[PDB]
């Protein structure tokens, strides 16, 4: 419930990682989600390559595993001068052993102690036992490889649901019984709207009769419902006494009354041109 | 797959010339901005060099103007960095980066974010 301008992130040239997938950064102002969900931390430089899809790597298998059919940003950018001290800041912790790696978006913050070896731990560290978080080393003299990444995943949720968030663009006015190209909730398309006399549920938004196109559809502005017919399409049959007799004509449009369009009205369609 | 990969490192005379090059894998190189970019021992990454896409604009740092000379060929996927009258302040570790503009305006004179990084080659300058 809140609009999101990406052009201010985009455009504002301090991230060091701007990775977009199944989404254009560039669109990322045009399209709009149900939800986005923000995830945001400091991680260190040789492992920022570590956050995207289909990855390997301590974070990425023991701490997040990502998705291979993610549909979202990957944004990050240096922390240099605002996350290290310079007696080391060992505020964030890491680990290097589990049991088995995470599953797509799980968080475990487990702190028991993993077993190396045969015999249990019993909540005590040692042989063949770690306590599974490590601390880093974040100075302001290290170099870039070890130096501090503050790292924000922006994943976008596109499902057949209201937007919730949508990008900087302006609404315009709604015109009716004409062909027009409509933009309704994000739903983009083209053909005549009618109103409609069906009544919609209070959580149903939008309406389906066989196939995957929406036949109704509901306003954002005011409480109310319309239903999209396609725009009028047809095959134009030509008629001919043959140009041999003559150069005359007549034309035959296939399944439609004679509005849209010596004029003959048949059960074929509109005919014109040919008398009655 | 998407690689960078730097090439042309070595150790010279100071006042002599080397030649880098940063080749393109898995992608083509020619719709991206590749800027050059080096650490000295001790000193943070700054930029050397950049060139746009279509090579019609190009920025360089000031300690190197009328040293070095910026280049690409979208033909061969490849953009060059000839450097001349070669110094020991540029001893270095020398990466190639590509980009797209993040803001308006043709010239490539701001930073920004690099999309694609290579491994990064060596060039000492020492006599």
């Known amino acids: 419930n809140c609009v999101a301008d990406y052009s201010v992130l985009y455009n504002s040239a301090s991230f060091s990682t701007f990775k977009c997938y199944g989404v254009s950064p560039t669109k990322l102002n045009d399209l709009c989600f149900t939800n986005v969900y923000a995830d945001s931390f400091v991680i260190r430089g040789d492992e920022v390559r570590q956050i995207a899809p289909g990855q390997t790597g301590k974070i990425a298998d023991y701490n997040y595993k990502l998705p291979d059919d993610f549909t979202g940003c990957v944004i990050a950018w240096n922390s240099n001068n605002l996350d290290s001290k310079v007696g080391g800041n060992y505020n964030y912790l890491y680990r290097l052993f589990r049991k088995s790696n995470l599953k797509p978006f799980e968080r475990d913050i487990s702190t028991e102690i993993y077993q190396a070896g045969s015999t249990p731990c019993n909540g005590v560290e040692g042989f063949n036992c770690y306590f599974p978080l490590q601390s880093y080393g974040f100075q302001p003299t290290n170099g870039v490889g070890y130096q501090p990444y503050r790292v924000v995943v922006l994943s976008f949720e596109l499902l057949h649901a209201p937007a919730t968030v949508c990008g900087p663009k302006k609404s315009t006015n709604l015109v009716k019984n004409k062909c027009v190209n409509f933009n309704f909730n994000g739903l983009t398309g083209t053909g005549v709207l009618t109103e409609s006399n069906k009544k919609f549920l209070p959580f149903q938004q939008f309406g389906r009769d066989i196939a995957d196109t929406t036949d109704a559809v509901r306003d954002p502005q005011t409480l109310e419902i319309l239903d999209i017919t396609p725009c009028s399409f047809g095959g134009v049959s030509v008629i001919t006494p043959g140009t041999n007799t003559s150069n005359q004509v007549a034309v035959l449009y296939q399944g439609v009354n004679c509005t849209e369009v010596n004029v003959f009205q048949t059960r074929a369609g509109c005919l014109i041109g040919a008398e009655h | 797959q998407v690689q960078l990969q730097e090439s042309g490192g070595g150790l010279v005379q100071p006042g002599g010339s080397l030649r880098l090059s940063c080749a393109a894998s898995?992608?083509?190189?020619?719709?991206?901005?590749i800027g050059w970019f080096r650490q000295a021992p001790g000193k943070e990454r700054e930029g050397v060099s950049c060139?746009?896409?279509?090579?019609?604009?190009?920025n360089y740092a000031d300690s190197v103007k009328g040293r070095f000379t910026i280049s690409r060929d979208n033909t061969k996927n490849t953009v060059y960095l000839q450097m001349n009258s070669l110094k020991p302040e540029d001893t270095a570790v020398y990466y190639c980066?590509?980009?797209?503009?993040?803001?308006?305006?043709?010239?490539?004179?701001?930073?920004?974010?690099?999309?694609?990084w290579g491994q990064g080659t060596q060039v000492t300058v020492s006599s």
């Open positions: 980066a590509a980009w797209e503009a993040s803001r308006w305006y043709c010239p490539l004179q701001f930073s920004a974010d690099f999309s694609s």
């Open positions: 060139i746009s896409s279509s090579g019609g604009r190009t």
């Open positions: 898995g992608f083509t190189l020619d719709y991206y901005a």
